[PDB]
UniProtKB/TrEMBL annotation, chain B:
The lineage of its organism: Bacteria, Pseudomonadati, Pseudomonadota, Alphaproteobacteria, Rhodobacterales. It comes from Rhodovulum sulfidophilum (Rhodobacter sulfidophilus). GO terms for molecular function: electron transfer activity; heme binding; metal ion binding. Keywords: Heme, Iron, Metal-binding. Coiled coil: none annotated. Pfam families: Cytochrom_C. This is Cytochrome c. Heme c binds at residues 42, 45-46, 67-68, 87, 89. The gene is soxX. NCBIfam families: thiosulf_SoxX. The keyword Iron applies. SUPFAM superfamilies: Cytochrome c.
Amino acid sequence: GPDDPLVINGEIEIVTRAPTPAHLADRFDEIRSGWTFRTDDTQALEMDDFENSGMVFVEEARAVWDRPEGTEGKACADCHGAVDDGMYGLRAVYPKYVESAGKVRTVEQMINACRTSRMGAPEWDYIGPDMTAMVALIASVSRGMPVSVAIDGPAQSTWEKGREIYYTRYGQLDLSCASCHEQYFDHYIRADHLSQGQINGFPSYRLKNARLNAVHDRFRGCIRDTRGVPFAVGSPEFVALELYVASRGNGLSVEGPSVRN
Amino acid sequence: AEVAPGDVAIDGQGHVARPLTDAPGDPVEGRRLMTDRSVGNCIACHEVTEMQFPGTVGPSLDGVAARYPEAMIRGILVNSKNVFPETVMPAYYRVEGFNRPGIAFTSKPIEGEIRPLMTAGQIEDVVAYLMTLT
Ligand code: HEC
Ligand code: HEC
Ligand code: HEC
């Protein structure tokens, strides 16, 4: 049910309802995980990693983490240590301003920077399966930690660009993200129960397509489905939108990989 | 003869008093268009009990012909925003002013002329169906 507690593996408390972030307080009485809009049967699939088909890909990425790839003969682990330590906390604070880049970066951009510049290995396609499994492994080791993305300082202009996109109507159907997820959350579009369109559970394992789904893949499909032209994955526009949408869920726990419709 | 998008007479309340085409509306086709996910896809947002798994974003259209005049129902279909400012209901007879319109769901930009989501005849067919909802 919507107000039931989510615990994972009997061990990990997930905050699924939280006070609305100050920047969004005008619009919601509280913020809620997408988990809280799912039926009981689907909710149960996220409560035990043994039942969460998304975690099969995570276990594969755990092996990839230790596997040398690229001309330099190194594995992620050779520089970052055990993934449970070296990636701890990271999902909760990206996208963030990155000192070396003078820009807000996403986790995916960081991973590909190490692959190319430090490993001598091929970049992973931004929303492909290899990248999305690794981002899911990174999310999984911070489950239960509050999403805490900064929205001011050097990230402000990026956050503002994302806010602008969130409320811009797109496509011939002429809808913004807010049209559905802010104005009409808890309503239904056909059989789908509209959530607040949060991303604290990404990458999501969708029962519909039986794979992990990257944030920018979801975003692309949402603008497409307004009968519109999405921005490119990895584009400045979707990096901005991701920072902004992540901040609409500040205070909810990291949940990825979550199980969703 | 159909009145082209640019030409519809629209009063101050968003009502449209005259049909968009001289062809009579076929309510049977109207029914099909509304549940055609490729055309009206109206059931995504609206329940009609006369007609599975309707959305709840819009109100039930049960009874709409008993409460709203034909001209108002037609106005809702031509450009819902004229009737319900800032509604999320799509404008089915508009061809201008979209941000990043794509060719259906192919993610490709529309180059050249933009056609309306429904034709004048499709709209009168749908209107004819809605008018049976008393
Ligand atoms: C040494 C040759 C490395 C290998 C192999 C990999 N990474 Fe890396 N990574 C490296 C450095 C020197 C840094 C910057 C650290 C800093 O504090 O500035 C990074 C950073 C990342 C990050 C961002 C970390 C953070 O604290 O914000 C990520 C997400 C990351 N690296 C991922 C990653 C993965 C998935 C790798 C295997 C494919 C990998 N790195 C290998 C150095 C090296
Ligand atoms: C109505 C026509 C929508 C518009 C416009 C946008 N979204 Fe959407 N989204 C919609 C549905 C019916 C669903 C599935 C049910 C639900 O959980 O809401 C979604 C889902 C998402 C999600 C996934 C949520 C999760 O896994 O917990 C995200 C992240 C999402 N939508 C984002 C999003 C954005 C950023 C949009 C503007 C570009 C947007 N959606 C528009 C319906 C609709
Ligand atoms: C959601 C994205 C919608 C789709 C798709 C369609 N309609 Fe709609 N409609 C919608 C809303 C939210 C509303 C209420 C106005 C508001 O913005 O609050 C409506 C209303 C109507 C009405 C008037 C009914 C009434 O007010 O009692 C009619 C006659 C109507 N809509 C018809 C209609 C048709 C025929 C559609 C498919 C072509 C259709 N709507 C799609 C939201 C949405």
